[PDB]
């Protein structure tokens, strides 16, 4: 046939020569082919610049007039385009994002320019790709390529890494109170790679929280409150290129009871010449599970009366007349009573 008929569907291929800044173009034919006015030796067209036509008209021995017409659209410069990394820092232990930069500008029309790109086995055609659920701590090879006009003229590779993800989460052997003011926690670290611990304890109103060194498995809670329930949490954290708290293992414990405060502005007052009237405000700190108030009456260093109450209110009554009373007054939780709250008070008349 014809040269127009047996090289019409010709292809070439685009070599780079980054010192002189120009393009060859590769005939694919097997047959050593030639060309009219410019010179194809070998079957390579060469010095062509960046983003402008060129024509070249082929022929062979083998093939008849007319001349296969054969335009050359010459692609933009290889150096003019950069594979960026754009990763999120807060997912990049599970995620990567990758994006190809045109750094400098070419006249080629950017509607002829297709971006390739392959992940593991997965391939994807855009100027910019994300994988999402990627295993944290792995390494993964995507490979990139430039076309235009379907032609592939540049290509790159990207190994990328994924950062540290969650640890977690401690096991705690036992967390308890032996006593009213303290408490014990006793765990296991976790497999996972970690750079300290968080406790948290849990009362009724309050939560308090803090750091713990990741040497550490044991420790002893000081200053808690007698007979409240406190709520543990124990968790463990990594600083990566963001901060990776893994799962919180949970124990609780109600502290010991103890005994209570002394009561609250206890007084005595005369209601006749041989009777008082004691009150006094319950105490701060009950710590302990039921309520009763006490009331000791001595007499010349001498227990003379001892009376009991729901409320701290008694009336003392026929007591002898010119004579100094001491009245010692106390909360009992049911476990343990409380420092007495002392008051003197002397009775009037005569005997
Ligand atoms: C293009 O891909 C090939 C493998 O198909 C590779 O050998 C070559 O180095 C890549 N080019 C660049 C510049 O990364
Ligand atoms: C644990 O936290 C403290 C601050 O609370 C910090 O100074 C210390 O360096 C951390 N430990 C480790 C091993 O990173
Ligand atoms: C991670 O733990 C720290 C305390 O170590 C806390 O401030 C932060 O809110 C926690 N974040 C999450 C999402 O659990
Ligand atoms: C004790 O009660 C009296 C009378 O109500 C009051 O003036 C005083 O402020 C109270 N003291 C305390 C410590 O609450
Ligand atoms: C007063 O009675 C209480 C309640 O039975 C008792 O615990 C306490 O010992 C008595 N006081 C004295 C000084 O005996």
Same mark, same amino acid.
């Given at each position: 046939?014809?040269?127009?008929?047996?090289?019409?569907?010709?292809?070439?291929?685009?070599?780079?020569?980054?010192?002189?800044?120009?393009?060859?173009?590769?005939?694919? *034919?097997?047959?050593?082919?030639?060309?009219?006015?410019?010179?194809?030796?070998?079957?390579?067209?060469?010095?062509?610049?960046?983003?402008?036509?060129? &024509?070249?008209?082929? &022929?062979?021995?083998?093939?008849?007039?007319?001349?296969?017409?054969?335009?050359?659209?010459?692609?933009?410069?290889?150096?003019?385009?950069?594979?960026?990394?754009?990763?999120?820092?807060?997912?990049?232990?599970?995620? %990567?994002?990758?994006?190809?930069?045109?750094?400098?500008?070419?006249?080629?029309?950017?509607?002829?320019?297709?971006?390739?790109?392959?992940?593991?086995?997965?391939?994807?055609?855009?100027?910019?790709?994300?994988?999402?659920?990627?295993?944290?701590?792995?390494?993964?090879?995507?490979?990139?390529?430039?076309?235009?006009?379907?032609?592939?003229?540049?290509?790159? $590779?990207?190994? %990328?890494?994924?950062?540290?993800?969650?640890?977690?989460?401690? =096991? %705690? %052997?036992?967390?308890?109170?032996?006593?009213?003011?303290?408490? *014990?926690?006793?765990?296991?670290?976790?497999?996972?790679?970690?750079?300290?611990?968080?406790?948290?304890?849990?009362?009724?109103?309050?939560?308090?929280?803090?750091?713990?060194?990741?040497?550490?498995?044991?420790?002893?809670?000081?200053?808690?409150?007698?007979?409240?329930?406190?709520?543990?949490?124990?968790?463990?954290?990594?600083?990566?290129? *963001? =901060?990776?708290?893994?799962?919180?293992?949970?124990?609780?414990?109600?502290?010991?009871?103890?005994?209570?405060? =002394?009561?609250?502005?206890?007084?005595?007052?005369?209601? $006749?010449?041989?009777?008082?009237?004691?009150?006094?405000?319950?105490?701060?700190?009950?710590?302990?599970?039921?309520?009763?108030?006490?009331?000791?009456?001595?007499?010349?260093?001498?227990?003379?009366?001892?009376?009991?109450?729901?409320?701290?209110?008694?009336?003392?009554?026929?007591?002898?007349? &010119?004579?100094?009373?001491?009245?010692?007054?106390?909360?009992?939780?049911?476990?343990?009573?409380?420092?007495?709250?002392?008051?003197?008070?002397?009775? &009037?008349?005569?005997?």
């Amino acid at each position: 046939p014809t040269c127009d008929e047996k090289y019409a569907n010709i292809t070439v291929d685009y070599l780079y020569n980054k010192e002189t800044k120009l393009f060859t173009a590769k005939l694919n *034919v097997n047959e050593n082919v030639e060309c009219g006015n410019n010179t194809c030796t070998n079957n390579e067209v060469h010095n062509l610049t960046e983003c402008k036509n060129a &024509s070249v008209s082929i &022929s062979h021995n083998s093939c008849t007039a007319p001349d296969k017409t054969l335009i050359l659209d010459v692609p933009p410069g290889v150096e003019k385009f950069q594979l960026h990394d754009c990763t999120q820092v807060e997912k990049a232990d599970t995620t %990567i994002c990758l994006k190809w930069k045109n750094i400098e500008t070419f006249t080629c029309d950017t509607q002829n320019i297709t971006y390739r790109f392959q992940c593991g086995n997965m391939i994807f055609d855009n100027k910019e790709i994300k994988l999402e659920n990627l295993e944290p701590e792995h390494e993964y090879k995507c490979d990139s390529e430039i076309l235009y006009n379907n032609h592939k003229f540049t290509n790159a $590779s990207k190994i %990328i890494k994924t950062d540290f993800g969650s640890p977690g989460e401690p =096991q %705690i %052997i036992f967390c308890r109170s032996e006593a009213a003011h303290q408490g *014990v926690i006793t765990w296991n670290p976790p497999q996972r790679s970690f750079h300290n611990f968080t406790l948290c304890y849990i009362k009724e109103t309050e939560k308090d929280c803090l750091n713990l060194d990741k040497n550490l498995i044991k420790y002893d809670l000081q200053n808690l409150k007698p007979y409240t329930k406190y709520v543990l949490s124990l968790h463990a954290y990594i600083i990566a290129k *963001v =901060q990776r708290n893994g799962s919180a293992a949970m124990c609780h414990f109600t502290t010991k009871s103890a005994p209570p405060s =002394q009561v609250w502005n206890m007084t005595v007052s005369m209601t $006749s010449d041989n009777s008082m009237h004691v009150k006094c405000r319950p105490p701060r700190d009950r710590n302990g599970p039921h309520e009763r108030y006490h009331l000791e009456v001595e007499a010349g260093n001498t227990l003379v009366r001892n009376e009991s109450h729901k409320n701290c209110d008694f009336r003392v009554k026929d007591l002898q007349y &010119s004579t100094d009373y001491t009245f010692k007054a106390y909360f009992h939780n049911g476990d343990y009573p409380g420092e007495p709250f002392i008051l003197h008070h002397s009775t &009037s008349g005569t005997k």
